[PDB]
From a paper:
The WT nsp4C monomer contains four α-helices (α1–α4) and two short β-strands (β1–β2). The refined WT model contains two nsp4C molecules in one asymmetric unit, termed A and B respectively. Notably, the N-termini of the two molecules are not aligned in the WT nsp4C dimer. Instead, they are projected in different orientations, with one molecule rotated by about 150° around the y-axis relative to the other molecule. The N-terminal amino acids Cys425, Lys421, Glu422, Lys426, and Asn429 are located in the contact surface between the two monomers. The hydrophobic cavity of WT nsp4C is exposed on the dimer surface, and the C-termini of the two monomers extend in different orientations. We propose that the surface properties of the WT nsp4C dimer are representative of an “open” conformation given that its positive, negative and hydrophobic areas are all exposed. In WT nsp4C, a disulfide bond at Cys425 causes the C-termini of the two monomers to extend in different orientations, and thus resulting in flexibility and undetectable electron density differences at the C-termini of the monomers. Our WT nsp4C crystal was obtained under non-reducing solutions, so it is considerably easier for two nsp4C monomers to form a disulfide bond in the crystal.
Here, we report the crystal structure of the C-terminal hydrophilic domain of nsp4 (nsp4C) from MHV strain A59, together with the structure of a C425S site-directed mutant. In particular, the C-terminal hydrophilic region from T408 to Q496 is highly conserved among all the coronaviruses, indicating that nsp4C may play a similar and conserved role in coronavirus replication.
Residue numbers in the entry:
A (entry chain A): 1 to 81
B (entry chain B): 1 to 85
The structure:
């Protein structure tokens, strides 16, 4: 699933981007995207439940960039493990 | 392009399906798909514009099947023709 992929390190390619997009509703994707700044600039501790959601944001953001900002592949790594 | 790919033989996979769906507007895709029967049971000779459109409907159909039906990596074969000079 998307939440699960968000926690692993892998390459975002046209193929993997695709499967990830198809695995999450567009509504969920945009909500994750909208939480990016909150986690990119999070002060303090992150309970796992928060880290899971922070990872989804990170992934949604990485996907947005791949798609809306270029034509090239990029390695994805979960937030500060 | 989508039109060009419909005239080639290749495997419809999750990745190829993807590049294909992204290369055509949803509207044009549904249009091609709607013409599948017209060309599938077409009686007679066609000009090149019609042949190209027939190939597109065939590709649109193979993609619909891949996505909505089973979703098993399948080979896409453009339509063959008995050409008359």
């Amino acid at each position: 699933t998307f939440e699960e992929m968000a926690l692993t390190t892998f390459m975002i390619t046209k193929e993997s981007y695709c499967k990830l997009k198809n695995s999450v509703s567009d509504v969920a994707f945009n909500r994750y995207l909208s939480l990016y700044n909150k986690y990119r600039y999070f002060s303090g501790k992150m309970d796992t439940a928060a880290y899971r959601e922070a990872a989804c944001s990170q992934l949604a953001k990485a996907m947005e960039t791949f798609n809306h900002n270029n034509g090239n592949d990029v390695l994805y790594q979960p937030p500060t493990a």
